[PDB]
Amino acid sequence: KENVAIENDGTPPRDKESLSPLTRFLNNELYGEKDARRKIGEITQTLLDHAVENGESQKVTLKGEAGRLTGYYHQGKVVLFLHGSGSSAEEQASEIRNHYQKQGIDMLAVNLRGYGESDGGPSEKGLYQDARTMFNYLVNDKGIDPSNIIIHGYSMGGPIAADLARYAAQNGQAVSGLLLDRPMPSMTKAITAHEVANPAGIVGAIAKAVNGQFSVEKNLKGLPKETPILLLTDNEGLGEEGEKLRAKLAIAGYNVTGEQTFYGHEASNRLMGQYADQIVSGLF
Fold it and tell me: Which helix (H) or strand (E) holds 248?
């Protein structure tokens, strides 16, 4: 019953933990290295400094459940961008934000815990929670009716975005639609795509050990099946698994649009250019 306004004051600087040798191994694999996770490139930053000075975008800090969640609100009704694995949201949104803003749509772009300048350390259930903070910030600090929002879930953001989509309709704050942008259909299948053939069962063990984590399917169950899900997949190994996912989802009655794309996994700008218009056509 605590749906209450959630912005906060930056007072630095961002903290993390150091844990056990093996979960250090794992977290690097699944989520990326802390340095990678937090890094914000010089060009990326300058473009962002400029944005604030023009009053195009403002820095935003939120009260997360484990700490603070940092990034920007960029403006031109609104995209909730959920970044994925391996780098700061700053980097991941940079090729993406322009394409929405140009059509006078605002984009919320906030790091999950352990990413960019946000506090804490990543985990399946932590990231889903941080998604809800970010949601609530839109609804509550900015009054935004949920049927002006879409959830752009890139990559690992894919399955996370799916869980948010569920929670929002399940809490009668349903969203205008979900974009699974080049999703991770499951962590196992993501770990699988970046390894080879039938490799050393060590790979198979870790892949198996982590079944049921960040499954789009699993995280979608109990979503109203008439909810708009655009699904754009990449042309590389991950994106195949997406096409199987696509099948399973049409099959189970989910209202699923989209197609396979001729773009690699990281080609965000090239992809957004082509599809930006279709995307806003499942926003209405």
Answer: helix 237-251
